[PDB]
Amino acid sequence: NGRCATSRYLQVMGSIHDIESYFALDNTLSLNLQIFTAHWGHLAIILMWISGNLYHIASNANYSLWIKNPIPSMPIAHNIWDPHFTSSTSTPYSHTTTAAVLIAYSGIYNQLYTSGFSTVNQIYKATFAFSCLAVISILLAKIHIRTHSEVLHNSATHASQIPSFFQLLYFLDVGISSINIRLNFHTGVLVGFFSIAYTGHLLDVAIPASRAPLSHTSLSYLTFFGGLKSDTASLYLTDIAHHHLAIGVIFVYIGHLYSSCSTALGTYIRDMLYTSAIYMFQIKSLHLALSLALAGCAVLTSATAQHIYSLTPYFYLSYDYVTSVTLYVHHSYIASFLAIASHAHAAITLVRDWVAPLELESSCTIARIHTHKAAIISHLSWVSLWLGFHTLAIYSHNDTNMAFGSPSKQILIEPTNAQLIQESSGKALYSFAINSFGSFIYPIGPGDLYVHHAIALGLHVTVLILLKGALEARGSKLMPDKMEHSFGFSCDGPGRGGTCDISAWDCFYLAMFWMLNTNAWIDFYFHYKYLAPRQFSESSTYLESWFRDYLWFNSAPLIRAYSALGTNDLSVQAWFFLLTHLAWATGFMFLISWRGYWQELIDIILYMHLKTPILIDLWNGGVYTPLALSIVQARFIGLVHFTAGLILTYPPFIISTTS
Amino acid sequence: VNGRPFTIRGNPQQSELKWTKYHMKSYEADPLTTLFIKARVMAFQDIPNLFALPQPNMEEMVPVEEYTKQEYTTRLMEALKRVQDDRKAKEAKSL
Amino acid sequence: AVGVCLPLTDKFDPLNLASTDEKLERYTQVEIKHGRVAMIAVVGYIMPEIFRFPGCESFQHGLAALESIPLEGWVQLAALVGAHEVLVKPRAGGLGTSDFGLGTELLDGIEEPELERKLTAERNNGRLAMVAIMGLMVQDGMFGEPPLSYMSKNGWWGEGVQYFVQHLNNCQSFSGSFVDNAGVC
Amino acid sequence: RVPGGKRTKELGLVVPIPEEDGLTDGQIAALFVVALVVLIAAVDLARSLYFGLQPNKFKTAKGKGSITPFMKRLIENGF
Amino acid sequence: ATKLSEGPFIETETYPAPKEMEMSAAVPFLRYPQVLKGWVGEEKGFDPLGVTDALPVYWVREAELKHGRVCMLATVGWIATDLGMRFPGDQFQSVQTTLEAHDKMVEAGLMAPFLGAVGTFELYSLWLFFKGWEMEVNRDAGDFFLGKQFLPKEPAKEKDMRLKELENGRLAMFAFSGIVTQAAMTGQAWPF
Amino acid sequence: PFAGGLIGGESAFAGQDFNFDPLGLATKCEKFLPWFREAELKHGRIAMLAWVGLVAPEFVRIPGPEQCYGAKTVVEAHNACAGDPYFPFIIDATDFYGKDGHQVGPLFQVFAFCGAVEMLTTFAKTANVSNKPGLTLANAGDYRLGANFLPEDEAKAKEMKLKELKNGRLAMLAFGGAITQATLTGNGFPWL
Numbered sequence A: 001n002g003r004c005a006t007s008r009y010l011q012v013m014g015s016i017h018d019i020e021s022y023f024a025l026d027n028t029l030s031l032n033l034q035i036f037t038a039h040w041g042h043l044a045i046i047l048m049w050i051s052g053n054l055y056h057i058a059s060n061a062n063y064s065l066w067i068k069n070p071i072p073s074m075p076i077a078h079n080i081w082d083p084h085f086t087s088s089t090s091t092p093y094s095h096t097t098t099a100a101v102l103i104a105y106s107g108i109y110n111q112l113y114t115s116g117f118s119t120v121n122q123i124y125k126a127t128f129a130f131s132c133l134a135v136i137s138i139l140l141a142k143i144h145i146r147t148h149s150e151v152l153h154n155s156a157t158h159a160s161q162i163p164s165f166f167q168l169l170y171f172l173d174v175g176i177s178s179i180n181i182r183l184n185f186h187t188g189v190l191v192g193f194f195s196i197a198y199t200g201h202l203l204d205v206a207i208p209a210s211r212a213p214l215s216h217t218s219l220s221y222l223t224f225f226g227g228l229k230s231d232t233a234s235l236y237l238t239d240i241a242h243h244h245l246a247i248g249v250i251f252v253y254i255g256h257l258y259s260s261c262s263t264a265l266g267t268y269i270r271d272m273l274y275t276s277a278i279y280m281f282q283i284k285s286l287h288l289a290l291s292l293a294l295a296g297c298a299v300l301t302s303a304t305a306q307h308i309y310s311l312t313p314y315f316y317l318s319y320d321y322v323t324s325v326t327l328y329v330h331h332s333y334i335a336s337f338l339a340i341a342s343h344a345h346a347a348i349t350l351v352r353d354w355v356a357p358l359e360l361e362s363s364c365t366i367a368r369i370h371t372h373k374a375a376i377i378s379h380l381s382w383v384s385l386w387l388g389f390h391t392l393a394i395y396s397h398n399d400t401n402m403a404f405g406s407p408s409k410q411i412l413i414e415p416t417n418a419q420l421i422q423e424s425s426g427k428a429l430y431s432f433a434i435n436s437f438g439s440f441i442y443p444i445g446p447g448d449l450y451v452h453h454a455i456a457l458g459l460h461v462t463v464l465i466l467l468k469g470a471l472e473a474r475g476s477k478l479m480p481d482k483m484e485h486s487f488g489f490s491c492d493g494p495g496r497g498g499t500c501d502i503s504a505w506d507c508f509y510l511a512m513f514w515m516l517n518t519n520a521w522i523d524f525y526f527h528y529k530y531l532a533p534r535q536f537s538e539s540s541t542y543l544e545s546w547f548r549d550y551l552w553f554n555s556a557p558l559i560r561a562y563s564a565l566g567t568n569d570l571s572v573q574a575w576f577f578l579l580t581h582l583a584w585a586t587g588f589m590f591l592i593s594w595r596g597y598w599q600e601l602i603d604i605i606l607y608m609h610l611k612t613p614i615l616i617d618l619w620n621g622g623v624y625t626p627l628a629l630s631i632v633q634a635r636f637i638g639l640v641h642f643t644a645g646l647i648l649t650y651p652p653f654i655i656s657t658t659s
Numbered sequence B: 001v002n003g004r005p006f007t008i009r010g011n012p013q014q015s016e017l018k019w020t021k022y023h024m025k026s027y028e029a030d031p032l033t034t035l036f037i038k039a040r041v042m043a044f045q046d047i048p049n050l051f052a053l054p055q056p057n058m059e060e061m062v063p064v065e066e067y068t069k070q071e072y073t074t075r076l077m078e079a080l081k082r083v084q085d086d087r088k089a090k091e092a093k094s095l
Numbered sequence C: 001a002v003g004v005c006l007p008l009t010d011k012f013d014p015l016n017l018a019s020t021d022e023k024l025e026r027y028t029q030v031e032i033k034h035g036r037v038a039m040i041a042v043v044g045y046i047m048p049e050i051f052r053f054p055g056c057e058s059f060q061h062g063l064a065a066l067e068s069i070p071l072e073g074w075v076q077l078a079a080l081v082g083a084h085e086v087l088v089k090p091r092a093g094g095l096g097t098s099d100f101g102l103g104t105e106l107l108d109g110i111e112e113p114e115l116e117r118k119l120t121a122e123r124n125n126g127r128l129a130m131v132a133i134m135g136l137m138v139q140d141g142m143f144g145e146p147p148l149s150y151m152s153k154n155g156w157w158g159e160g161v162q163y164f165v166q167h168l169n170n171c172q173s174f175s176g177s178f179v180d181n182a183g184v185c
Numbered sequence D: 001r002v003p004g005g006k007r008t009k010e011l012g013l014v015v016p017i018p019e020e021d022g023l024t025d026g027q028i029a030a031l032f033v034v035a036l037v038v039l040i041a042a043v044d045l046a047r048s049l050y051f052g053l054q055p056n057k058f059k060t061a062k063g064k065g066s067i068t069p070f071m072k073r074l075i076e077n078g079f
Numbered sequence E: 001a002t003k004l005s006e007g008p009f010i011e012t013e014t015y016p017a018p019k020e021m022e023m024s025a026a027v028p029f030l031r032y033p034q035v036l037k038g039w040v041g042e043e044k045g046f047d048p049l050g051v052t053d054a055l056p057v058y059w060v061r062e063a064e065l066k067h068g069r070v071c072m073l074a075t076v077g078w079i080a081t082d083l084g085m086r087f088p089g090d091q092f093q094s095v096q097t098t099l100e101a102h103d104k105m106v107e108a109g110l111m112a113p114f115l116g117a118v119g120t121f122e123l124y125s126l127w128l129f130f131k132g133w134e135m136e137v138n139r140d141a142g143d144f145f146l147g148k149q150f151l152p153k154e155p156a157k158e159k160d161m162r163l164k165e166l167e168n169g170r171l172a173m174f175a176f177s178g179i180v181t182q183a184a185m186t187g188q189a190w191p192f
Numbered sequence F: 001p002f003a004g005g006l007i008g009g010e011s012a013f014a015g016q017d018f019n020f021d022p023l024g025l026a027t028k029c030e031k032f033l034p035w036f037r038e039a040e041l042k043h044g045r046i047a048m049l050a051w052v053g054l055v056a057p058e059f060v061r062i063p064g065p066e067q068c069y070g071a072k073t074v075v076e077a078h079n080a081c082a083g084d085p086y087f088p089f090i091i092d093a094t095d096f097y098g099k100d101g102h103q104v105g106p107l108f109q110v111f112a113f114c115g116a117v118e119m120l121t122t123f124a125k126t127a128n129v130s131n132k133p134g135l136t137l138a139n140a141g142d143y144r145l146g147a148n149f150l151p152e153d154e155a156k157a158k159e160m161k162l163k164e165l166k167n168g169r170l171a172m173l174a175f176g177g178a179i180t181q182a183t184l185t186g187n188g189f190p191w192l
């Protein structure tokens, strides 16, 4: 199609991986095969990422020196080869005659060290092997493409005599879309047997590497101590091995649940769902499966974010002031993204996958939810309003009283429920000890109570927006016929009072801001309590403490990184602090100023180009005629700028303050 | 032109006509298609009595080169009746 | 056509040397042979640096190999090449004089676009190999050592272009510099 | 290094640097050979993904297609 | 009877009588796999583990030929080295016994170029194997077009030659496995 | 009929069917009747072998390694031959030749071979995709091993199968009693 504008690129890039929207993707067979191949390529990318990390650790870094003195030493991420740096004098990242290096804040050093890596040769062998695994993944993608092509050819060449041969149309993608066998093998082999295999790895490599004296592998390597070994300040490796052994056994047992290879054994998921409380749903729906997987991944990512910090599993990881914060924040952000992703894909499932029954029929869980979506949304709004009103009001009361200089006048509600739960947990742990757990129990005060209620507000409002989008995706009082329109469309016009941000994609756009806010609140809470436990406990009850003792006070090293006096190793962090501020501010433009103004401006610019003497005779403007970004395109671009600035301006701050 | 013989909400569900002519345009389906899809969604609520499609026997596959259309339809119908009788016997065994 | 890729929409022949079909065929054959020899010669330059066959450790690598290897050994090598060139003829019914029935199983019964792609890849690799082998031989002759060893000792910019980059970060060899960094570029 | 971190300056944390690079030129070359194999395979995979499935193959392609017995058993079992 | 079950549908299918069923000659209590038909060595249908029920017979035949050839070369080389044959050269003559030869040559630095050459040929073999399996080129499993001149013209003699190759490779598999295991166990020459 | 017409449920007296299923397990789980018959015959076979294996060692003992073959009685024979591995069926890797005394014994070898035979016969007959009728009531416990010996007459074949089943059941009970009595009294053959 030669007739095109510059919006062509953005329209394509917004759905490059929306395989269901592809032209000439006739059937679910094509859809599933394309998705499988994309998955293989994704695994190849992950393996190449692992191989690159390992290679750079081996070559550009100091793993061998670090493992000798892990406590004061700092791992190297990779060298800096940037021509723009000053050549007259040494940079802050060099030893005045040495290649510039970057410190590593990913904990991969601790990971390798407690896995059992002793020499750079082992890291090199791993780099090589993971590259080979990437090759294997790509070749498997090719193999499966060929096998599925060979089945289509067969079905074309051979036909059942009876007219029911068309029934085979449904079973061509059975290997990719079968649920019982996939569940059995995933939960039994990919999870349980993988855990058992890692137990074997620990017993064979990690335990001997950690233990100075040689001792034959035996049940003595399996223990149920708890807490952190004093020397490494981490969970006993012997306990990790038992842990994984136990989980592996349990999940290997659970992996015989469904009928996978024969119909003589196992039960059916259709049958469980039919007989259970949830009536039934489109288990075949790829969007629904993606939503469930994303929800599970989000909860697991949050769990690891909390537990890696609480119970240190890696040698000397706790000693690394910066790496702990970086890991927690990283996995918290990933978890938030995965949660909002699950919600967005549930909305998409409702839009284009769910087969709604007739209105009066109420047989499925989704229909039952749609019956009282109004009640759900109203109650969620009530909870959000209560939390916001009271949290903000108590914080403002404390703010005003502190500003007037009377801390005694502050409202300080003791967290009695959380303290009782914590005391019960401590009682259980003390009983176990009589038969250390660091950071699993924390002082907990009224400031913690207020911050927890703020985080609850954030979660409730995010879920409010996402649930409203999902439950109004098919229809709404303002736009009853929303099923016909795509998942994301600009608007419905200025009629009916105006219909800005009326689509389910627009609800996601809105919930993205909240996710970022609630995640920022969580990260600020963790970082403040981590940096200054005592000051946080005493002063975190009013917002001026957050604005002064946390942001303004700890912002000094970052902004002072590079100045008229000189530069230090945080100069890069200071430049990325400002670059990300600028990106956020740019996102404000696409978020505030909308398309008509920019289309008219583009028209004027195009007029100028067409009136320019030399340029007109070469460039007509007919092909890829410039245009202003569409409404949805600009919404997304502004959201991307906002998200990039917000997310990327934090790591510089945390590194500066914790380093 | 572009006239639809039903209320605006009379359009078929987008998810119902998937991988068909109207893959993502439920507002362009013909009235007959809308009626057929509506009747299908009404029919598929009665789970207890829905004929489960018999699983094909992949062994009985022959080349296309290797009769009458009506005769093959009749043979298919005999096969379907045999399948239904077998299902009835199997279910009545234990009930 | 064969030998024409995306960067050049039409055949590249500014001097119109391939005016006639006979001359075009002769030039195609010569170019194919030259590209093949150049490709093997370029791997030939790179691989002895990595390793040497047993008994070949003493011999010099590049143009110095001409003096180092015995004249008898060079005679034997040229005799082998001449025997191959004189006792091997294009396979009857082949694509032309450039083919000798070596690996034709892979190209038999394939789609013509794929055959054209394979031929064009052969030709393009041969051309790049001609350019690269001339670069390698010229650099070896000028700087007295094989280009790979020379780059290991001096880097990508060595003793001929280092003057341009004498003030660059990680490549700064200017007089009075606090670091030499000349061998790392 | 010119550290800019308060904790780094206070505790004297250091970024030790080895005397010799961890890997040699031959090792880097081997890793690059593996990476080149990955790149060739990845380009082939990208081409396959771009072009998708080809249902016309039954008209001209050699052979008569084949379904593995296990795949047939899965089809018979159903979903 | 080569059909697993006769009938348009599974639930109403009928199975051939056991006397009619075609049973494997190697293991008489299993039916003939029926996928390794027209291949070399099919005369004794032997696939109790049902590997061919998951992998195309092309892959397993390629792997079998590769293993048999590698094991034949390995056993002849191990026997020669144990008997004492060695390359004329200081580095090759220094090594005393075959068991330590792998480590000695890895240290000496020959095994790295050797593995490089083998890996180059193996990448070519992988490309060729994928081409032949996908049928882009007209190739059979484990066919590299080497020595096609000596291949008998008659179809029966060609099949006999291929069967001899496969049987000798199968024998060499066990031969080398036993040789290496016994050598590692005891520490003596090939005759043991 | 009863238990899907399987053999072995007939009383010694002519005209009366013993049909011993006190728990009604056949009716409760009819779809597993071929598997039950296979398991019954396998238990009977292992037991008929194991009883003679309890008796003969007293008369003769092969002179293997004395770590086990010097066992006082059949009760301790299993513990002696199983070795003392760090885990029940785990080979010692650091000390392969059992110098530390923590290596699996010959029972591990026989167990590995039994596992290979099982995976290649029973799992092969039951789970193979290329064997669709697979394990049924008619062929349960039949691996075609020696089937050329049984009498041609179908009635005589049924009688021989019944003899096998009865002898296997008697051997199951006899081995249970023999091993338990050996454990309790630790005496020779009369209490095995």
Ligand code: CLA
Binding pocket: A249, A250, A253, A254, A255, A256, A257, A258, A264, A265, A266, A267, A268
């Ligand atoms: C979560 C609860 C649950 C429920 C309600 C059912 C219900 C059912 N299952 Mg079961 N099943 C479960 C879990 C469950 N299953 C799990 C976890 C597995 C994996 C091991 C299986 C695997 C399974 C198979 C393979 C089959 C069934 C079948 C059945 C049916 C018969 C049950 C029966 O006879 O039990 C009474 C029998 C027992 C209580 C004996 C069970 C003994 C084994 C060893 C399992 C016990 C494992 C234990 C709970 C975990 C050990 C953990 C470790 C730390 C020690 C019935 C519909 C059968 C059916 O008809 O399917 C259509 C069938 O074929 N189930």
Ligand code: CLA
Binding pocket: A017, A018, A019, A020, A035, A038, A039, A042, A043, A046, A286, A287, A289, A290, A291, A292, A293, A294, A295, A296, A297, A299, A300
């Ligand atoms: C062309 C672009 C493209 C790309 C690059 C990918 C990439 C991916 N897709 Mg795919 N996908 C695509 C298009 C694409 N997809 C399209 C168009 C669709 C149709 C809607 C899908 C539908 C789809 C589904 C349905 C799924 C994927 C998944 C994946 C992953 C593949 C395997 C992997 O490496 O996981 C690496 C992942 C891990 C190492 C993490 C494993 C842990 C999982 C994710 C969570 C398990 C939770 C469990 C169910 C519950 C726990 C309970 C506990 C809390 C008590 C990867 C992120 C899978 C995935 O992981 O989704 C999140 C998946 O389930 N995709």
Ligand code: CLA
Binding pocket: A582, A585, A586, A588, A589, A592, A593, A597, A601
């Ligand atoms: C920091 C935030 C930000 C930024 C960067 C801009 C930028 C711009 N706005 Mg403004 N704008 C903002 C916020 C911002 N706005 C907000 C929040 C709103 C909503 C109220 C608006 C509303 C708005 C309107 C309504 C209009 C503008 C206009 C403009 C343009 C002014 C002319 C120009 O481009 O000269 C300066 C350009 C820059 C400073 C951009 C950065 C240039 C850097 C320094 C150099 C680039 C270096 C290099 C080449 C980068 C290569 C990178 C690559 C290799 C990866 C410019 C694109 C006007 C316009 O378009 O006039 C023509 C206009 O009409 N803006």
Ligand SMILES: CCCCCCCCCCCCCCCCCC(=O)OC[C@H](CO[C@@H]1O[C@H](CO)[C@H](O)[C@H](O)[C@H]1O)OC(=O)CCCCCCCCCCCCCCCCC
Binding pocket: A009, A010, A011, A012, A013, A014, A015, A486, A487, A488, A489, A512, A630, A632, A633, A636, A637, A639, A640, A643, A644, A647, A648
């Ligand atoms: C770096 C760390 C910090 C930052 C983290 C990243 C930022 C946060 C993520 C953004 C938040 C939203 C994420 C959701 C994504 C899907 C949304 C979507 O498709 O809707 C985006 C929608 C989709 O498009 C709409 O689709 C609708 C159908 O649903 C209709 O057809 C609409 O008309 C159509 O506009 O809008 C767009 O088309 C957006 C325009 C996209 C332009 C991008 C082109 C430039 C790309 C350059 C960058 C490289 C890209 C590759 C990245 C490499 C990474 C390895």
Ligand SMILES: CC(=O)O[C@H]1CC(C)(C)C(=C=C/C(C)=C/C=C/C(C)=C/C=C/C=C(C)/C=C/C=C(C)/C=C/[C@@]23O[C@]2(C)C[C@@H](O)CC3(C)C)[C@](C)(O)C1
Binding pocket: E072, E073, E075, E076, E145, E146, E147, E148, E150, E168, E171, E172, E174, E175, E176, E178, E179, E182, E190, E191, E192
């Ligand atoms: C033009 C072109 O392209 O090239 C041509 C060239 C040419 C020649 C035509 C070709 C060929 C064919 C070739 C080279 C064929 C080679 C075949 C070999 C080397 C076979 C070895 C078998 C060893 C066995 C069975 C050992 C068996 C050993 C056993 C059984 C040992 C058994 C015991 O050791 C064990 C295991 C323990 C000991 O204690 C006891 C004993 C019994 C000694 C080409 C490559 O195709 C094409």
Ligand SMILES: CC1=C(C#C/C(C)=C/C=C/C(C)=C/C=C/C=C(C)/C=C/C=C(C)/C=C/[C@@]23O[C@]2(C)C[C@@H](O)CC3(C)C)C(C)(C)C[C@H](O)C1
Binding pocket: C050, C051, D025, D026, D027, D029, D030, D033, E112, E113, E116, E117, E120
């Ligand atoms: C063609 C033909 C015939 C022929 C022929 C003949 C005799 C051909 C002979 C060909 C011959 C003798 C070909 C050697 C290749 C060696 C290679 C590729 C080595 C690569 C080695 C590599 C890539 C190793 C690389 C490295 O690992 C190293 C070593 C060190 C590590 O740090 C890492 C790196 C990556 C740097 C017949 C049979 C006579 C008739 C037939 O009709 C036609």
Ligand SMILES: CC1=C(C#C/C(C)=C/C=C/C(C)=C/C=C/C=C(C)/C=C/C=C(C)/C=C/[C@@]23O[C@]2(C)C[C@@H](O)CC3(C)C)C(C)(C)C[C@H](O)C1
Binding pocket: F075, F076, F078, F079, F172, F173, F175, F176, F177, F179, F180, F183
């Ligand atoms: C059916 C029937 C009837 C009946 C009946 C009845 C009551 C049947 C009872 C059967 C019963 C009760 C059968 C026990 C078997 C026990 C076994 C096999 C134990 C093996 C134990 C073994 C192999 C142990 C071995 C070892 O421990 C040893 C020795 C030493 C250790 O170092 C090593 C190990 C652990 C390996 C009626 C009632 C008469 C009615 C009708 O008329 C017919």
Ligand code: SF4
Binding pocket: A490, A491, A492, A493, A494, A495, A498, A499, A500, A501, A594, A631
């Ligand atoms: S054009 Fe913009 S302002 Fe007007 S109705 Fe649509 S979204 Fe709202």
